[PDB]
UniProtKB/Swiss-Prot annotation, chains B, D:
CDD domains: PRTases_typeI. Regulates the transcription of the pyrimidine nucleotide (pyr) operon in response to exogenous pyrimidines. Also displays a weak uracil phosphoribosyltransferase activity which is not physiologically significant. This is Bifunctional protein PyrR. It is an enzyme of class 2 (transferase). GO terms for molecular function: uracil phosphoribosyltransferase activity. A motif (PRPP-binding) lies at residues 99-111. Its EC number is 2.4.2.9. Belongs to the purine/pyrimidine phosphoribosyltransferase family. PyrR subfamily.
Length: 174, 177, 174, 177
């Protein structure tokens, strides 16, 4: 049994809202200096990558600015995906925003942290996620959250994005 | 003296962001549910109203749709003899509406509690939410904003000055001792 | 169909935890001065009163100190209960902690605020509740919360306390 | 110079309060569910351990029950050649346990991230939570504490000094510029 949490229209609005929050918290409207960091979005495959693309694309059209974005494959860091793609310049002294679709256990994000340190040494790392569905197993939290969804362990939350799934949305299932 | 908390750039982006949040939480981007309450913004005079107008218009720039908005004077409800600004309720009233009260700064919460009194003299909303630009802490009542531009730790000896372009000529926030 | 959210033992622990939080936030371990307020707990009948009693009683045994407690009848302020009982000294310049069992709409708390101002003029008002079950209709929030419980509108949350119900606990129903 | 953030009185009460919170969130007051993980506290040396010991013992003073507790040295995992304190894992290990990492102050989060690395070299917990006395903001990693004594806005030029009686002779917290 299915039930929809977020419509296509909700997903798109939520993403633009998140882009605004990123612009605010990372000072992208401000001039630049030691406390305006270079920002890079890295998605966790598969849907995390697409979200990072949608965010980088919203940011650009809202602020005119091109933030680096890419993908961080965590296959080798886990306890047919996109391979790792790091923008030109790398991530040394950058503010990396890790992007994922759903924050559940937090284990995927911990894996991303590990994979990141093989890439280089960011000044800071933040986390943006479309859904936070509780049940953390690690002391992790998202800086930017589309929707907080209370769930039971027997429920599954599924994020659908156009590119992979044909339509945007989020559904809960049992 | 004084330091800039928010630049003009920071103000417009934050107002845009709150408009986005209002759309989400009250469901303007979707076709309107069976018993969804209409949304009405009521500013607290004078800068609350300036903010409400900007939000209404960002909401329409961003999502094309038109929310009722207006002004709720609270002069007589706070703390001379008379109301210093006009109360303006959009057509259709606020009965069974979702009213969002809008102010520049959330401090003690006493202004919002006044506005709850004033609203009750206008009508009977289904629900009341609160949007502010700055929440500066130091609540004296169990009130909080639904929407907040910036949360700003302050000392009781600091002051927060919000400027909005249509009322003040520039956008900005500064804090002074 | 029923299901239990909090056992008797959970309820009692949660109450003592709340008493500790009150001691901390209201400076009852500190000497006294213009920023150590006199504290008074007022319960909203029926179960809110009993909770205020249980809290005042936990505070006393934890810190040795006797905080004023009473009841605030909101019958005349609503949109066979306990009548209003205000401790000696009243509430002028006090820190009043309103106590209720469940925070739902917030309308009961708004009614309490109104009833309070007929009693006198506190320096500040806080709110302590055993359960917050979402679905606010007013911009109100509890300073102290036992359990946050996500609910649907069709669910009912019931707080049971020994004195009224025979055993402590909280149950969700449909 | 320096001002008192927390008196000795404030420290003991706050530690007691966190012990209460740990009991709730991990379910020590109830008869233990079918697949409830056992709870183990691991302090980060040296004051983290002092705090963990106090929590373990408040938890037993308050609820009579005994949680595993110990020390996780992170010397080699942060940032010389060697470990400056001892790692001490209680009998039964941490495999499929609920480990609560305990430290005095949560700042950047880099110490906690080190401790996650160190924990992984000890075993495979089912879950890891974090308790700290003071969270002073300025996170550089997406980490947060499950349990916090006090949230303290700070500037990067301020320092927070936690003193706990068994390690330092008095209980207290001060902040200095």
């Amino acid at each position: 049994e299915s039930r929809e949490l977020m419509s296509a229209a909700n997903v798109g609005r939520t993403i633009s809202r998140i882009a605004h929050q990123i612009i605010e918290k990372t000072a992208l409207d401000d001039p630049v200096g030691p406390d305006a960091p270079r920002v890079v979005l890295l998605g966790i495959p598969t849907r995390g990558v697409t979200l990072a693309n949608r965010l980088a694309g919203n940011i650009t059209e809202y602020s005119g600015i091109h933030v680096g974005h890419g993908a961080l494959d965590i296959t080798l860091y886990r306890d047919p995906l996109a391979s790792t793609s790091i923008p030109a310049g790398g991530i040394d002294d950058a503010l990396v925003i890790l992007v994922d679709d759903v924050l559940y256990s937090g284990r995927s994000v911990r894996s991303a942290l590990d994979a990141l340190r093989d890439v280089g040494r960011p000044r800071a790392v933040q986390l943006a996620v479309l859904v936070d569905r509780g049940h953390r197993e690690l002391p992790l939290r998202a800086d930017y959250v589309g929707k907080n969804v209370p769930t039971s362990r027997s429920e599954s939350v599924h994020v659908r994005l156009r590119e992979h799934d044909g339509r945007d949305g989020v559904v809960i299932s049992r």
